[PDB]
């Protein structure tokens, strides 16, 4: 059995990553059909980064100012348009490795695998999720722009993330493939801090069910609690308010293990007021909120007795 | 910034995964050139994992019994050989997606990425480590046999693991691509179990070294201690004794850092009693030992792989 933080096979995405260069700046781009997507701050320099006028920079730019590299073969740019905060570079040849894809703007709390890239080549793949403050706790260095996040459903690659910047607190912020940012962020050089990062309550509960399958059944309580008793009382270290939509998707995990959704919420009420003197849970020490209820069933193909 | 447990881009490996079927059992196989590698226990139906004669079943079974299937086209096997504990099938045509591969055997302590596959189709990829007891705490389900572990240098894929079975204790055991098991395990399912597991000391120091490279500073101090006395507490606790070569491997981690290898020993001997009076230690308030120093520099630099 076992349970680990897995990521989707990044193979289908590697075939779409290319290198985009504009002047002295070099970052990654997503090659889909005959269009190359990348963050729009590639056409900017250091002097004009205080308050860039992308409309002015885009028009005054040229097609040959962009140097798109697909591995070692250079791609010819025939047109350039801007959609919000992502740049669309139209090329002459379509990407033969284009997989069936879609653009999905995920909500804060959902997970997705990221493919970190540098100079158009993939470096690594990891799983993560958007924090409540519309940020991600990924790992990026200089030249990581263009690193996309994605999920794979059946066989279609649902892109959702497009890395742009890194907050001074260490976290990262990005957009979707349509160019809309995630959170109160804008791509310009100004005093821009992150926000209050709480905790994904629903993910924590799901992570508990994942542990119950692989042994670890010593954190079950027999005193369910209501809604306000889990919010106005169980919010000492900031936890996202659980809604009646979370218990809907937690059904399969509840009918599988046998622990009611409301009953599992009482388990956290005991751990959030005490903790452990050294007793580990599944694998980690602090509650992991990086596993959605869909990730658990995805990796714990258990049967739900009825 | 940021430090995640990344896995290698599995693209070059996904193109080598096929579905091997013999009789009624179907497990995964690695298609490299015109040879398909898969566990030897594919020729053994679910009624022979006790003491079956393999060289007798191999010469008895012909080529029509096997059924190798790629993405959508079925292959044709010609020669079937058994090397140690891997069933080699010499197919008709060679895999056009064959990368510059390489069969290497890793000793307990090194890390590698695992590509989980079912029915010849990848499903997930994660990063793990070879435990001191010659096992891995991976995530596998029924039908995952044949899934391989690999490392990438740049253009070369270093295969090092092939899943064969799961032990009753939850961990998983397998072989290299030469067919030799990791540890005193056998393919015939008996009452075999893994030994006592220990924590990799060199990997914890390499991980604690990245914490400083990132910016986390609160558990640091300076109480020098040479290579003599630290082994006392390392063996009394549940840790692998820090050998002499482990110090030389941490060399490059001290060049672009300046901290002495013997300096971090004072910070580790104190975080094993008082608990976590601070909690935040690069995320996850516990000792992580699945970061080999060779992979800590690659994530703190930007080493890409094609």
XYZ file of C-alpha atoms in Angstrom:
612
model
C 0.000 0.000 0.000
C 2.047 2.919 1.314
C 1.151 6.605 0.996
C 3.370 9.321 -0.474
C 3.024 12.808 -1.926
C 2.932 11.790 -5.589
C 2.852 13.977 -8.686
C 1.329 13.357 -12.088
C 3.578 11.967 -14.847
C 5.079 15.108 -16.359
C 5.895 13.422 -19.677
C 3.090 15.076 -21.631
C 4.194 18.501 -20.379
C 7.926 18.105 -21.079
C 7.126 17.910 -24.794
C 5.626 21.412 -24.619
C 8.284 23.282 -22.616
C 10.440 25.645 -24.681
C 12.931 28.433 -24.000
C 11.810 32.025 -24.611
C 14.355 34.855 -24.696
C 13.773 38.591 -25.167
C 16.922 40.706 -25.141
C 18.836 39.726 -22.001
C 15.984 37.950 -20.178
C 15.525 34.207 -20.692
C 12.658 32.128 -19.313
C 10.484 29.151 -20.195
C 7.397 28.972 -22.375
C 4.571 26.525 -23.003
C 4.433 25.392 -26.642
C 0.871 24.353 -27.521
C -0.233 24.047 -31.160
C 1.327 27.082 -32.938
C 1.250 29.330 -29.843
C 3.884 29.760 -27.121
C 2.652 30.979 -23.731
C 4.916 32.664 -21.183
C 4.717 35.434 -18.564
C 4.605 38.894 -20.108
C 7.404 40.357 -17.950
C 9.938 38.868 -20.382
C 9.842 42.055 -22.488
C 10.905 44.207 -19.517
C 14.274 45.466 -18.299
C 15.464 46.657 -14.894
C 14.895 50.377 -15.497
C 11.253 50.077 -16.616
C 10.219 47.476 -14.020
C 8.981 50.043 -11.475
C 5.785 50.772 -13.446
C 5.981 48.938 -16.779
C 3.655 49.914 -19.625
C 3.191 46.501 -21.210
C 0.965 47.958 -23.931
C 3.786 50.310 -24.938
C 6.484 47.638 -24.629
C 4.451 45.077 -26.584
C 3.693 47.301 -29.584
C 7.232 48.683 -29.806
C 8.584 45.117 -29.670
C 9.159 42.929 -32.727
C 8.751 39.279 -33.660
C 12.477 38.605 -34.070
C 13.054 40.216 -30.660
C 11.734 36.918 -29.245
C 14.050 33.902 -29.542
C 12.015 30.726 -29.017
C 14.110 27.564 -28.639
C 12.502 24.108 -28.710
C 15.391 22.145 -27.249
C 18.047 22.826 -29.850
C 15.912 23.822 -32.868
C 14.918 27.486 -33.098
C 11.291 28.433 -33.744
C 10.259 31.349 -35.954
C 7.943 33.971 -34.440
C 5.260 35.381 -36.739
C 3.126 37.323 -34.242
C 2.865 38.371 -30.617
C -0.250 39.217 -28.605
C -0.881 39.742 -24.896
C -3.791 38.266 -22.926
C -3.758 39.749 -19.408
C -0.394 38.827 -17.776
C 0.673 36.025 -20.161
C 2.376 36.575 -23.515
C 1.230 34.605 -26.568
C 3.898 34.181 -29.258
C 2.513 32.698 -32.473
C 5.032 30.479 -34.262
C 5.143 29.179 -37.829
C 5.222 25.461 -36.946
C 2.765 23.792 -34.582
C 4.022 21.580 -31.768
C 3.689 17.938 -32.904
C 3.795 16.826 -29.247
C 0.718 18.892 -28.341
C -1.476 16.789 -26.020
C -5.190 17.202 -25.500
C -5.210 20.031 -22.965
C -7.498 22.485 -21.198
C -7.133 25.718 -19.232
C -8.609 25.348 -15.735
C -8.485 28.038 -13.039
C -8.357 26.016 -9.825
C -9.623 27.289 -6.484
C -7.415 27.690 -3.398
C -7.157 24.275 -1.780
C -6.803 22.099 -4.864
C -3.527 20.320 -5.580
C -1.491 20.174 -8.770
C 1.928 18.962 -9.878
C 4.522 21.521 -10.976
C 7.286 21.013 -13.546
C 10.195 23.302 -12.685
C 12.234 24.336 -15.723
C 15.339 26.376 -16.505
C 16.325 27.532 -20.004
C 13.448 25.494 -21.437
C 14.656 22.181 -20.000
C 12.750 20.407 -17.204
C 14.548 20.122 -13.868
C 12.091 18.413 -11.515
C 8.462 17.649 -10.749
C 6.684 17.976 -7.405
C 3.154 18.109 -6.011
C 1.739 21.108 -4.154
C -1.415 23.159 -3.650
C -2.415 26.805 -3.521
C -2.465 28.124 0.024
C -5.530 30.041 1.260
C -3.647 33.290 0.546
C -3.468 32.386 -3.179
C 0.220 31.440 -3.044
C 2.218 28.232 -3.441
C 5.152 26.927 -1.407
C 7.155 25.592 -4.333
C 10.865 25.619 -5.126
C 12.117 27.983 -7.831
C 15.358 29.760 -8.717
C 16.318 32.353 -11.318
C 14.935 31.462 -14.729
C 12.023 29.412 -13.378
C 9.432 31.662 -15.039
C 7.165 29.695 -17.343
C 7.169 26.654 -15.060
C 3.566 25.478 -15.349
C 1.408 23.492 -12.950
C -1.078 20.942 -14.199
C -3.328 17.991 -13.480
C -3.933 14.993 -15.751
C -7.502 13.680 -16.008
C -8.027 10.450 -17.952
C -5.525 11.572 -20.590
C -6.081 15.358 -20.882
C -3.596 17.787 -19.334
C -5.458 20.507 -17.412
C -3.042 23.405 -17.005
C -3.752 25.845 -14.190
C -0.569 27.585 -13.003
C 2.025 29.842 -14.641
C 4.856 30.971 -12.378
C 5.717 34.677 -12.365
C 7.291 36.052 -9.180
C 8.353 35.187 -5.631
C 7.158 37.059 -2.557
C 9.699 38.381 -0.027
C 8.386 35.829 2.492
C 9.658 32.981 0.284
C 6.348 31.797 -1.204
C 5.544 32.088 -4.915
C 2.745 33.660 -6.943
C 1.603 33.022 -10.494
C -1.261 33.164 -12.991
C -3.414 30.812 -15.035
C -2.907 30.068 -18.715
C -5.457 32.815 -19.441
C -3.285 35.395 -17.648
C -5.400 36.054 -14.550
C -3.294 36.178 -11.398
C -4.035 34.155 -8.263
C -4.632 36.665 -5.481
C -3.976 40.392 -4.981
C -0.766 40.337 -7.020
C 0.417 42.276 -10.068
C 3.572 41.806 -12.151
C 5.505 44.951 -11.297
C 8.400 45.801 -8.982
C 6.824 47.361 -5.892
C 6.479 46.688 -2.176
C 4.165 43.664 -2.446
C 3.880 41.289 0.508
C 2.002 37.996 0.783
C -0.911 37.420 3.163
C -2.274 35.436 6.107
C -1.653 31.758 5.314
C -4.158 29.702 7.311
C -4.664 25.957 6.777
C -6.747 23.884 4.357
C -9.134 22.200 6.800
C -10.660 19.794 4.273
C -7.222 18.553 3.211
C -6.272 17.841 6.833
C -9.343 15.654 7.354
C -8.650 13.792 4.108
C -5.036 13.259 5.179
C -6.350 11.600 8.346
C -8.469 9.115 6.392
C -5.358 8.329 4.344
C -3.520 7.430 7.554
C -6.364 5.282 8.909
C -6.022 2.999 5.876
C -2.298 2.390 6.473
C -2.723 1.506 10.120
C -2.644 4.452 12.513
C -6.114 4.289 14.095
C -5.331 5.793 17.510
C -6.733 9.287 16.802
C -10.432 8.370 16.634
C -12.769 10.210 19.009
C -16.300 9.279 20.059
C -17.753 12.782 20.561
C -18.837 14.417 17.312
C -19.162 18.196 17.073
C -21.343 20.632 15.141
C -20.261 23.463 12.811
C -19.737 26.450 15.121
C -18.124 24.177 17.722
C -15.454 23.479 15.072
C -15.024 27.129 13.993
C -15.505 29.545 16.910
C -13.637 27.052 19.143
C -11.287 25.121 16.825
C -9.428 28.006 15.204
C -6.449 28.581 17.499
C -3.860 28.250 14.697
C -6.055 29.478 11.821
C -7.977 26.809 9.896
C -10.223 27.312 6.892
C -13.940 27.241 7.816
C -15.328 23.865 6.800
C -18.398 24.144 4.567
C -21.166 21.693 3.723
C -19.448 21.251 0.345
C -16.377 19.690 1.974
C -18.459 17.017 3.715
C -20.038 16.207 0.340
C -16.719 15.238 -1.257
C -15.604 13.584 2.005
C -18.483 11.107 1.676
C -16.545 8.351 -0.093
C -13.757 8.597 2.494
C -16.352 8.494 5.291
C -18.335 5.514 3.985
C -15.049 3.714 3.257
C -13.325 3.900 6.646
C -16.588 4.043 8.610
C -15.777 7.274 10.472
C -18.430 9.941 9.984
C -17.293 13.275 8.569
C -18.534 15.172 11.624
C -16.905 12.514 13.814
C -13.519 13.025 12.148
C -13.764 16.769 12.794
C -13.869 15.906 16.502
C -10.549 14.073 16.148
C -8.825 17.331 15.201
C -10.490 19.001 18.193
C -8.428 16.656 20.379
C -5.154 17.103 18.478
C -5.511 20.874 18.018
C -5.746 21.316 21.813
C -3.096 18.767 22.874
C -0.826 17.285 20.211
C 1.601 14.388 20.628
C 4.442 13.792 23.083
C 6.425 12.179 20.252
C 3.860 9.901 18.611
C 4.010 10.251 14.827
C 1.020 10.301 12.471
C 1.430 8.255 9.285
C 4.790 9.850 8.498
C 4.967 13.534 9.401
C 4.689 15.309 12.764
C 2.479 18.308 11.917
C -0.844 17.848 10.138
C -0.344 17.839 6.366
C -2.938 19.885 4.460
C -1.513 19.169 0.985
C -3.752 16.162 0.184
C -7.247 16.759 -1.164
C -9.981 14.151 -0.621
C -9.584 13.243 -4.300
C -5.836 12.667 -3.896
C -6.428 10.162 -1.084
C -8.919 7.986 -2.967
C -6.687 8.375 -6.028
C -3.792 6.798 -4.109
C -5.800 4.644 -1.656
C -7.941 2.583 -4.026
C -9.992 1.206 -1.141
C -13.470 -0.303 -1.221
C -16.474 1.360 0.432
C -18.699 -1.276 2.016
C -22.436 -0.612 1.869
C 13.871 30.100 -2.560
C 11.755 27.210 -1.312
C 12.814 23.578 -0.943
C 10.568 20.764 -2.181
C 11.099 17.007 -2.460
C 11.196 16.968 -6.242
C 11.335 13.929 -8.508
C 13.058 13.682 -11.862
C 11.053 14.442 -15.022
C 9.660 11.025 -15.911
C 9.109 11.835 -19.594
C 12.033 9.799 -20.904
C 10.846 6.815 -18.836
C 7.129 6.882 -19.679
C 8.015 6.210 -23.316
C 9.556 2.894 -22.226
C 6.633 1.503 -20.198
C 4.597 -1.338 -21.704
C 2.051 -3.867 -20.458
C 3.361 -7.441 -20.231
C 0.758 -10.212 -20.013
C 1.481 -13.919 -19.541
C -1.397 -16.243 -18.703
C -3.681 -14.368 -16.313
C -1.225 -11.983 -14.600
C -0.494 -8.552 -16.080
C 2.347 -6.364 -14.797
C 4.458 -3.539 -16.198
C 7.604 -3.820 -18.278
C 10.481 -1.594 -19.338
C 10.954 -1.395 -23.118
C 14.536 -0.429 -24.002
C 15.722 -1.046 -27.576
C 14.186 -4.399 -28.675
C 14.232 -5.904 -25.156
C 11.463 -5.757 -22.540
C 12.416 -6.146 -18.875
C 9.823 -7.231 -16.315
C 9.790 -9.217 -13.056
C 10.396 -12.944 -13.351
C 7.192 -13.754 -11.435
C 5.030 -12.823 -14.438
C 5.226 -16.421 -15.707
C 3.997 -17.611 -12.284
C 0.227 -17.501 -11.883
C -1.300 -16.691 -8.498
C -0.645 -20.231 -7.245
C 3.131 -20.718 -7.427
C 4.715 -18.026 -5.195
C 6.137 -20.520 -2.709
C 8.860 -22.584 -4.394
C 8.459 -22.635 -8.198
C 11.089 -23.846 -10.645
C 11.758 -20.948 -13.012
C 14.274 -22.423 -15.465
C 11.698 -25.196 -15.957
C 8.798 -22.823 -16.652
C 10.910 -20.605 -18.924
C 11.970 -23.405 -21.277
C 8.436 -24.836 -21.188
C 6.684 -21.573 -22.069
C 7.042 -20.418 -25.669
C 6.666 -16.970 -27.253
C 2.910 -17.190 -27.892
C 2.220 -17.221 -24.142
C 3.564 -13.700 -23.601
C 1.605 -10.647 -24.754
C 3.437 -7.307 -24.700
C 1.307 -4.222 -25.380
C 2.479 -0.630 -25.826
C 0.281 2.473 -25.897
C -2.150 1.048 -28.445
C -0.133 -1.386 -30.617
C 0.613 -4.939 -29.498
C 4.181 -6.194 -29.809
C 5.583 -9.562 -30.892
C 8.108 -11.372 -28.698
C 10.836 -13.563 -30.204
C 13.247 -14.541 -27.419
C 12.560 -14.960 -23.705
C 15.421 -15.074 -21.199
C 15.740 -14.925 -17.410
C 18.640 -12.972 -15.888
C 18.625 -13.520 -12.119
C 15.117 -12.221 -11.316
C 14.119 -10.274 -14.453
C 12.337 -11.830 -17.439
C 13.894 -10.405 -20.610
C 11.669 -10.453 -23.714
C 13.411 -9.700 -27.019
C 10.610 -8.118 -29.057
C 10.438 -7.537 -32.816
C 10.880 -3.779 -33.233
C 12.979 -1.536 -31.002
C 11.529 1.325 -28.982
C 12.036 4.578 -30.947
C 11.737 6.485 -27.644
C 14.726 4.703 -26.088
C 16.870 7.183 -24.118
C 20.546 6.818 -23.286
C 19.823 4.443 -20.408
C 22.147 2.875 -17.839
C 21.781 0.100 -15.238
C 23.303 1.082 -11.884
C 22.994 -0.449 -8.421
C 22.575 1.987 -5.522
C 23.629 1.301 -1.947
C 21.349 2.087 1.014
C 21.316 5.854 1.390
C 20.894 7.071 -2.173
C 17.645 8.453 -3.581
C 15.781 7.979 -6.848
C 12.462 8.744 -8.511
C 9.779 6.064 -8.844
C 7.261 6.054 -11.709
C 4.144 4.172 -10.621
C 2.514 2.291 -13.503
C -0.562 0.096 -13.868
C -1.442 -1.882 -17.001
C 1.579 -0.369 -18.739
C 0.261 3.170 -18.188
C 2.043 5.514 -15.739
C -0.116 7.092 -13.049
C 2.225 8.834 -10.613
C 5.838 9.731 -9.908
C 7.480 10.304 -6.527
C 10.934 10.568 -4.958
C 12.081 8.086 -2.309
C 15.270 6.580 -0.881
C 16.815 3.140 -0.415
C 16.328 2.443 3.283
C 19.195 0.949 5.328
C 17.148 -2.275 5.509
C 17.218 -2.503 1.682
C 13.566 -1.466 1.318
C 11.594 1.580 0.170
C 8.538 3.230 1.726
C 6.924 3.718 -1.661
C 3.299 3.784 -2.779
C 2.265 0.750 -4.827
C -0.949 -1.189 -5.413
C -1.772 -4.516 -7.038
C -0.629 -4.521 -10.651
C 2.263 -2.104 -10.082
C 4.965 -4.763 -10.516
C 7.475 -3.690 -13.143
C 7.503 -0.046 -12.062
C 11.105 1.145 -12.194
C 13.152 3.634 -10.205
C 15.568 5.914 -12.003
C 17.937 8.852 -11.753
C 18.908 11.273 -14.524
C 22.328 12.891 -14.905
C 21.380 15.052 -17.901
C 20.795 13.009 -21.057
C 21.305 9.594 -19.408
C 18.660 7.685 -17.435
C 20.188 5.566 -14.654
C 17.703 2.809 -13.873
C 18.291 1.348 -10.421
C 15.095 -0.323 -9.148
C 12.239 -2.536 -10.323
C 9.355 -3.261 -7.973
C 8.639 -6.955 -7.407
C 6.605 -7.362 -4.211
C 5.380 -5.781 -0.983
C 6.417 -6.974 2.451
C 3.837 -7.539 5.218
C 5.424 -4.691 7.213
C 4.154 -2.225 4.580
C 7.463 -1.392 2.875
C 8.347 -2.575 -0.639
C 11.292 -4.577 -1.964
C 12.610 -5.022 -5.469
C 15.630 -5.640 -7.664
C 17.942 -3.727 -9.955
C 17.806 -4.131 -13.731
C 20.362 -6.948 -13.458
C 17.764 -8.921 -11.479
C 19.574 -8.951 -8.121
C 17.327 -8.124 -5.175
C 18.170 -5.332 -2.752
C 18.656 -7.168 0.528
C 18.091 -10.785 1.598
C 14.763 -11.095 -0.224
C 13.438 -13.630 -2.728
C 10.762 -13.533 -5.409
C 8.984 -16.615 -4.029
C 6.571 -15.264 -1.420
C 7.303 -16.830 1.971
C 7.401 -15.621 5.594
C 10.243 -13.217 4.759
C 10.400 -9.793 6.395
C 12.714 -6.798 6.382
C 15.214 -5.954 9.096
C 15.318 -3.032 11.485
C 15.304 0.353 9.747
C 17.607 3.206 10.763
C 17.780 6.905 9.931
C 20.367 8.086 7.408
C 22.615 10.506 9.288
C 24.379 11.937 6.226
C 21.035 12.712 4.575
C 19.763 14.582 7.644
C 22.884 16.761 7.717
C 22.589 17.339 3.966
C 18.959 18.330 4.538
C 19.828 20.536 7.517
C 22.508 22.099 5.303
C 19.890 23.164 2.752
C 17.881 24.809 5.539
C 20.717 27.309 5.981
C 21.190 27.691 2.219
C 17.510 28.653 2.067
C 17.460 31.053 5.013
C 16.050 29.236 8.040
C 18.136 30.244 11.071
C 17.011 29.571 14.644
C 18.247 26.079 15.569
C 21.892 26.986 14.896
C 24.785 27.457 17.320
C 28.446 26.446 17.675
C 29.716 23.676 19.980
C 32.395 21.890 17.965
C 32.596 18.096 18.113
C 34.973 16.028 15.987
C 34.219 12.706 14.264
C 34.825 10.677 17.453
C 32.143 11.474 20.040
C 29.174 12.051 17.715
C 29.062 8.347 16.816
C 28.278 7.578 20.470
C 24.850 9.235 20.489
C 24.234 8.246 16.857
C 24.319 4.523 17.657
C 22.588 4.797 21.043
C 19.645 6.451 19.270
C 18.104 5.104 16.040
C 20.513 6.571 13.491
C 23.083 5.203 11.068
C 26.648 5.863 12.298
C 28.242 8.740 10.395
C 31.167 7.099 8.604
C 34.407 8.822 7.600
C 33.576 9.223 3.904
C 30.254 10.869 4.799
C 32.302 13.884 5.905
C 34.098 14.178 2.563
C 30.796 13.979 0.668
C 29.536 16.992 2.648
C 32.532 18.955 1.349
C 30.840 20.657 -1.607
C 27.938 21.593 0.684
C 30.412 23.582 2.821
C 32.222 25.356 -0.035
C 29.311 27.619 -1.037
C 28.215 27.878 2.609
C 31.288 28.147 4.832
C 29.863 26.129 7.734
C 32.058 23.365 9.122
C 30.822 19.798 8.708
C 31.447 19.147 12.413
C 29.472 22.252 13.424
C 25.912 21.086 12.721
C 26.389 18.092 15.036
C 25.673 20.300 18.058
C 22.305 21.332 16.592
C 21.163 17.760 15.888
C 21.981 16.281 19.311
C 19.659 18.833 20.967
C 16.573 18.434 18.740
C 16.092 14.834 19.968
C 14.691 15.523 23.447
C 13.091 18.953 23.892
C 10.880 18.368 20.838
C 10.269 21.276 18.438
C 10.294 24.499 20.463
C 10.093 26.442 17.202
C 8.177 24.097 14.915
C 9.072 25.696 11.575
C 12.172 23.920 10.252
C 11.893 24.280 6.462
C 8.448 22.714 6.775
C 7.483 19.427 8.400
C 8.612 19.517 12.048
C 10.660 16.320 11.980
C 13.977 14.953 10.717
C 13.883 14.283 6.967
C 16.505 11.853 5.651
C 15.526 11.435 1.979
C 17.786 14.185 0.583
C 21.187 12.914 -0.512
C 23.862 15.643 -0.658
C 24.321 15.061 -4.398
C 20.664 16.056 -4.900
C 20.731 18.968 -2.436
C 23.186 20.845 -4.665
C 21.162 20.170 -7.824
C 18.027 21.755 -6.344
C 20.016 24.721 -4.966
C 21.590 25.413 -8.380
C 19.354 24.634 -11.353
C 20.689 21.443 -12.927
C 18.300 20.503 -15.738
C 17.941 17.208 -17.626
C 17.244 17.689 -21.339
